[PDB]
Structure formats: C-alpha cells, structure tokens
C-alpha cells in the first residue's frame, strides 16, 4: 500500500519526499524524515482547520472563510507568534 | 498542483459538518507550502552544520522545535513520533 496509508497519515508522504529531493535540500533524505515532515504538516493543518471551524460555528456559518481563518490566527497566541509576518489577500 | 485534496480530507475529519471557501483553501495551501519550505530550509541548515548527507527524523524534529513555538512544537513532535512509529511498525 501507499506510504501514506502505511504511516496512517493523510498528507502525501511521497509528494513530500519528491519535493524535498527536488529542492535538493540535502544529498539524501531518510525514510522517517519524510513521514515525520508529513505528520507535522498534517498536525498543523488539522489545528488550523479546527480553530477555523470553531470560529465559523461561533459566527454562525456553514463554510469556512478567510475571515474565520484570520479570527482563528489572531485568537490563538501561538499561531500569531508563528504567522506575525504573514500577509493574506483580501 | 497543491494539497487541496489532503486539506479537504483533514477538514472533513476534524469537522465533518462544515465547508470552506476558495480563498480559504488557497490560504491553507499557501500556509502548507510555507511551513514545508521553512522546515525544509531549517533542516538543510542543520544538515550542513552537522556535515550530513541525509535529512533524518532527528533533523526534522530539531527543525520543528526551532520553528514552531513551545507547546505547538511539542504537540507536533509527539504527532510526528507517533506517525513514524506507526510507519516503521
């Protein structure tokens, strides 16, 4: 089965490994390194989406929007410290 | 390409009863690409410092702990550890 299914994650371990090897961040890449990176990306995305859905249910809406993402990012102190220097369209 | 399909899967898993917008999906993809790039750059720096020719799980953990804040970094490290364990299992 696919390495994504093997690791049980949802992000594409294969695409992550290919992007790493293409950017040439290093001569090689281990087998656990890509799984770990995919897991970290999935956890971060899951946290962002959780906060965005929470903000959406607070605002009484059925679809997440950039407003909900912004509200989530500025309500979570850690995400703010993480994306302070980040800009978003509209 | 993009991680839109995977972001949608994670969204349906965390909140199976909600949606998202086109701009919201784009912002999520930009965030995913940016986090990937930051972690990859930090990992490349650490590998060049250690004079290694292969990025490893230890390098990725160090990069994560250097990038993300404290509690978030610890949770991400725990998730990655569980993931790599299930993978090697």
């Amino acid at each position: 089965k696919t390495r994504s299914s093997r690791a049980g994650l949802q992000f594409p371990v294969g695409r992550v490994h290919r992007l790493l090897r293409k950017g040439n961040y290093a001569e090689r890449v281990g087998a656990g390194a890509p799984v770990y990176l995919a897991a970290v990306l999935e956890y971060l995305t899951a946290e962002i989406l959780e906060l965005a859905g929470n903000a959406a249910r607070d605002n009484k809406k059925t679809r997440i929007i950039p407003r909900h993402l912004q509200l989530a990012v500025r309500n979570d102190e850690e995400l703010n410290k993480l994306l302070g220097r980040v800009t978003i369209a509209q | 390409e993009s991680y839109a399909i995977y972001v949608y899967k994670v969204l349906k898993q965390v909140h199976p009863d909600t949606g998202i917008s086109s701009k919201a999906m784009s912002i999520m993809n930009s965030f995913v690409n940016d986090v990937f790039e930051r972690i990859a750059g930090e990992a490349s720096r650490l590998a060049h410092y250690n004079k290694r020719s292969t990025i490893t799980s230890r390098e990725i953990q160090t990069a994560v702990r250097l990038l993300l804040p404290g509690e978030l970094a610890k949770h991400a490290v725990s998730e990655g550890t569980k993931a790599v364990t299930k993978y090697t299992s």
Binding site: - | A4, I5, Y8
Partner: peptide
Amino acid sequence: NPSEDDYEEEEED
C-alpha cells in the same frame, strides 16, 4: 469543492 475531477486517484509505482 472536491468534485469528480478532485476524487481522482494517484499514479502507479
């Protein structure tokens, strides 16, 4: 939204 064009699978090994 994940339409049929989005439900596509991956490629072979």
